[PDB]
Structures are given as C-alpha cells and as structure tokens.
Design a protein around this ligand. Sequence first.
Ligand code: IMN
Ligand code: IMN
Ligand code: MYR
Ligand code: MYR
Ligand code: MYR
Ligand code: MYR
Ligand code: MYR
Ligand code: MYR
Length: 582
Amino acid sequence: HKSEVAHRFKDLGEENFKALVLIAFAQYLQQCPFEDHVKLVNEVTEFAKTCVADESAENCDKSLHTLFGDKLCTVATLRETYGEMADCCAKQEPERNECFLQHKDDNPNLPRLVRPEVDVMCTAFHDNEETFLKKYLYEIARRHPYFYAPELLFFAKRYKAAFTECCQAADKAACLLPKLDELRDEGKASSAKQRLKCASLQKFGERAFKAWAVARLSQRFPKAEFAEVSKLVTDLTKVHTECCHGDLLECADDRADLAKYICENQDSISSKLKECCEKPLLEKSHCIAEVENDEMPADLPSLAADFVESKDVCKNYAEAKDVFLGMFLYEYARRHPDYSVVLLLRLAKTYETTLEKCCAAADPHECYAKVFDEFKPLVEEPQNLIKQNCELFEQLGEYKFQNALLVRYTKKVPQVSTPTLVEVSRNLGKVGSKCCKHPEAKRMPCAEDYLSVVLNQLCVLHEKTPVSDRVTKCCTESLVNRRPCFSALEVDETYVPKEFNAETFTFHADICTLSEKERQIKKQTALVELVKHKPKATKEQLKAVMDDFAAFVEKCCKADDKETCFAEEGKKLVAASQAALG
Ligand SMILES: COc1ccc2c(c1)c(CC(=O)O)c(C)n2C(=O)c1ccc(Cl)cc1
Ligand SMILES: COc1ccc2c(c1)c(CC(=O)O)c(C)n2C(=O)c1ccc(Cl)cc1
Ligand SMILES: CCCCCCCCCCCCCC(=O)O
Ligand SMILES: CCCCCCCCCCCCCC(=O)O
Ligand SMILES: CCCCCCCCCCCCCC(=O)O
Ligand SMILES: CCCCCCCCCCCCCC(=O)O
Ligand SMILES: CCCCCCCCCCCCCC(=O)O
Ligand SMILES: CCCCCCCCCCCCCC(=O)O
C-alpha cells in the first residue's frame, strides 16, 4: 500500500497500536524513563492519524523501519545514555536497523520489579487504569527485549482482567495474589521457551528444527497431507529464523502471512481452526499455535506397509533421504498425539540408523525387517517413568512429593548448590501436579512441554558456575538425548559428605510466623543439607528424622514459649538424629 503506518493503524486499532509502539520502544531504548516513551508514543500515534486521514500527507510513504529509526534517533541523550548505539544513527536504514538490533541488551542490570501490596495496586488501578498498566507494560518490556510484543500484549489483557475482577472482590488478596503468581510463572515459561527455541536453532541447526516441526505439526494436523505439512514446516522455519534475529516487523509480518495462509487452506489442514480463524489479526497466529489436536482419520493404514514390508524402501530412501524420513515422521506423529515430540525423533533417528546400516547390505528387507521392535523399549521408558512418578505423586501430595525428588537428586549430584536443588526439585514437583491430573494419553506431551524449560533453565545456571561433569555431559548432549541422560544419572558414590555444622540445623521461632511457601523452603533446605551430610542415609532412616522434625515444629510452635522449646527440644533432636544416622 501507499502508507504502512496508516495500514497498520487501521487494522490494529488505536488502542493496540499505542500499546505495541510502547513495547517496541521500551525494548530498544531500555534505559529511558516511562514519561519519555509515552511522549514518543503520542507523537507516533498522532503521526499515524495524519496518514489515516491523508495517505499522502508528508512522510506517510516512509517504511516502518525508517520512521521507527528516525524517531529513535531523536532521543537527544542517545549518545550520553546509550553511547555506542547513537553511532547507529549515522548509518543508512538497512544497516541502521541492523545496528540497533545488535545493541539490544538481552539482560540489562535493572532492579528486580517488586510486587506492591494488593491495596496499593488496586487503588492505583482504580485511580488510573491506563498509566497503571502501561507503566508495568513498560517495565516488563524493557526487561524482556525479545518477548514477541503481541504476546506481551496478550498477557497485559489477562493482568487487567485479574485486577478488574479481584479489586472489586471481598477478599482482594485471596483473589489477586494467586492470579498474579500464575501469570508470572506462565510469563516466565513463555519467555524461556522463546529463548530456548532460538538457542536450539543455533546449536542444532535447521535439520533438527525441521524434524521437530514435522513431528509437532502432524500430531496437531493429522488429516493434512505430507506436502501441506512440508509447505508449513518450510514457512515456519523462515518465520522462526526471522523472529529469532529479533526484528519485530519482519517477524510480525511473517507470522501474519502464515496465519492467513493456514486459515484460507483451513479445510485442507484441520477442522479445529474455525474459532482461531475468525479472531482479529493481532490474535490469529497466537491462537493457532495453541489450537488443540485435530481428530485422526481412524481409517489409517499400517506404517509397516510402506516402511518395513514394501520393497523399494531403500530405493525411496536413497532417492531423497530426508523427505522419506520426514514421511516416516509425519506418518508416525499423526498416529501418536500421545507421544512427546522428542520420542518421535528418537524413533525417527533409530529408523534412520537402521536404513543406513542395512540398505548397504545383501538382503535389505531382512536386515531392517524387525525395526519396529527396537522402538518398543524407546516408547516404554518415558511411559513407565510417567506412571511411576504420577503414582508416587498421588500417594504423597505435591509437597511430600517434592521432598522425595529432593532426596533423589541430591544423592545423584551432591556437588550442586542447595538453593539450586531446592528450586529445580520444586518446579519438577509442579510439573507433576500439572501433568498427572491429565489422562494418560496427554501426560507425555505435557511433561515434555514443562520439563524442557526446567532442564534448560537448570542447564544455563550450571553453565555459569559448573559443578559436575555429568550435568555438563547431559546439558551439552543432543536435544533428543538430554532428558534420558539426566534420567540415567546414578547415586554419586564418589561424593565425600559435608562436615557437620550445628548452625545449619538450628531452627528458631520465626519458622512459625512464616508463610507456607517460606516454611517449606526452610524445611526443604535443611533436608538437602541433611542428605549432603549423610548421603548414605536410607529412605527409612531419613523418613524417621523427617517425622521427628515434623512434630518438633508443632510441639514447639503450639508451645507456651517458643525460642526455648526450639533450643531445648532442638538440642535433643540434633543429638538424637545424629545418633540414628550414625
Ligand atoms: C522475583 O521473581 C520474578 C519471577 C519472574 C519475573 C520477575 C520476577 C519479573 C520482574 C523482574 O524482572 O524483576 C519479570 C518480568 N518476570 C517474568 O519472567 C515475567 C515475564 C513476562 C510476564 Cl507477562 C510476566 C512475568
Ligand atoms: C512448530 O515448530 C516447532 C519447532 C521447534 C520447537 C517447537 C515448535 C517447540 C514448541 C512445540 O513443542 O510445539 C519447541 C519447544 N521447539 C524446540 O524446542 C526446538 C527444537 C529443535 C530446534 Cl533446532 C529448535 C527448537
Ligand atoms: C504484562 C504487562 C501488564 C502489566 C501488569 C502487571 C501488574 C502486576 C505488577 C507486578 C509485577 C511483578 C511481577 C510479579 O512478581 O508478579
Ligand atoms: C513502528 C513499528 C511498530 C508497529 C507495530 C507493529 C505491527 C504489529 C502487527 C502484529 C500482527 C499480528 C501478527 C501475529 O499474528 O503474530
Ligand atoms: C521435510 C522433512 C525434513 C525432516 C527431516 C527428518 C530427519 C529426521 C531425523 C531424526 C532427528 C534427529 C535430529 C538430530 O539429531 O539432529
Ligand atoms: C510427570 C512429571 C513428574 C516429574 C517426573 C518426570 C517424568 C516425565 C519423564 C518423561 C519425559 C518425557 C519427555 C521425553 O520423552 O524425553
Ligand atoms: C542441578 C541439580 C538438579 C539436577 C537433577 C536432575 C533432574 C533431572 C530431571 C529429569 C526428570 C525425569 C525423572 C528422572 O528420570 O529422574
Ligand atoms: C544431622 C541431623 C540433623 C537433623 C536435622 C533434621 C532436619 C530435616 C528437615 C526435615 C524436613 C521434612 C519436611 C516436613 O516435615 O514437612
């Protein structure tokens, strides 16, 4: 069209426009104050209005990159505040924009955002919704310069829904606090998944990305043909590459194009895309990526037909190795919405290794004849781990289950930091209380989903300050081997126990006035420390100490005088427990 700004303004709407422009500026000029971004937003919005009125008004023909760059180069203290970035303003638009991307600090040194008391949030909310949401939208955006803006907007709307509902509530905190804690964690998940995807595309490359996509796309769109899924995997690959590079505009347009493409060829891809395809521009793709699996054909052939029995397997394979393997994947994925994607990759790899070391053999059909039999153990491993861990989780509750994982992992990698073990073990616990609620056929995909950010999360920390070759081994392993690798870790028999420390096991009355979350973390921390001191303790011996301690808390909190009780019964516990654990 003649004017990009006019166009984007028209189909986005003034409200969404103003919010996205704010997010975009905050992601670049991460250091400028809120008031300064607001002024820029107004100016751009006002400019946009001009172009809507007259497609030919001055500058309305300029591209969004150019306009955006010029306005960015308007900041007077660009050099005094951002220094080197100001030099970007000396380049021509193609490089100017590229120059701006390179200086986008992925993790600046801003103070952590503190959550104020519910009454002050609700009052600030009621007294001025706009500036209240925009300011925090600003705070989140500057800290997460790579968070896809439209999605960051999608979150804002959920935050607003939570205040609207909760601030008019009888018990505001009882309504708000849990909603904010859920929004936060979810916000974290989305952010980490985005970073992980881009990171993985760099290490492993396009082939791995494509395989993962064929598997995922065909599980969701089991009725589409392999050529449609291939088409989609290709476009999808261009979109992620672009979006990872960090250019919002290119990214947003690539996502829009793909979304309309899918919606137009709707009936040819999935029947569950109707809802999503009605929604407005800003939401289409977000919706589609989240869409539920379509129902499969039911009248579907046996894989062993074309991939085992049939002659020409090797002829079809040598003619185009990746396409044939992709075909396998497509065929195997759309018949298994219940398998995790990485499990579908393990099978595809196994199949590949087999065809390679078989198609170069006397009688092919016989060399690879029993390949589907190798799959069995690959499939069962993840299944058995799930049932097993969900069972245990049903018995104990979330908390006691978290404590079990705490003992398990501490004995495996005692070298790891206690606060790290505590955190990882807790999140792992939450993955259990979130996936085990699901019926079997959906558990594995669930776990994979959550378990992957947790494992990467833990791998990054270890990256910083490495403490074990084994963790490093699993962390640098292949995407397909990461989780099985951690699963294979055995008790660390080498580990030399920490010297006892009286302090570490001294508890005061403050443990009675602390919040549930706080109390638990103190107990759990003492637990990791317990195991690090007596790594040979039994589940029996251990459970006995945890039982004494259990009461010890109550017998001292619900006691006439604390302090003393904890120092009196406290001396006892430690002396006794030390003896039981020899
Ligand atoms: C102290 O524990 C946390 C945990 C997660 C946090 C933050 C602080 C902060 C604040 C800070 O950076 O200090 C942000 C921004 N977190 C997110 O990951 C996030 C991302 C997107 C949304 Cl929509 C919501 C939350
Ligand atoms: C629809 O296309 C994809 C492609 C890759 C994906 C995902 C989705 C999802 C999300 C989903 O499972 O739907 C995750 C988590 N991916 C990765 O971890 C990943 C794996 C390998 C590489 Cl090389 C790069 C990224
Ligand atoms: C997502 C952008 C909209 C901003 C609204 C967020 C309001 C809640 C402020 C609290 C943020 C601190 C993060 C947290 O710990 O919950
Ligand atoms: C000045 C540059 C900022 C202009 C705002 C960028 C336009 C955002 C369009 C988002 C389209 C939704 C695409 C999607 O489905 O993800
Ligand atoms: C057009 C379809 C292309 C998909 C290619 C299929 C390749 C499957 C190989 C199994 C995945 C192993 C991943 C890896 O180790 O890099
Ligand atoms: C079920 C969540 C509780 C935590 C225990 C982890 C069990 C899930 C392990 C299965 C991993 C699925 C991904 C994969 O196949 O590698
Ligand atoms: C940094 C110390 C924590 C490391 C603990 C490893 C956690 C691995 C998670 C794998 C979950 C699958 C269940 C399992 O096989 O143990
Ligand atoms: C050397 C032995 C010192 C004894 C220290 C005992 C502390 C163990 C913490 C037990 C926490 C279990 C959690 C719970 O009961 O809910």
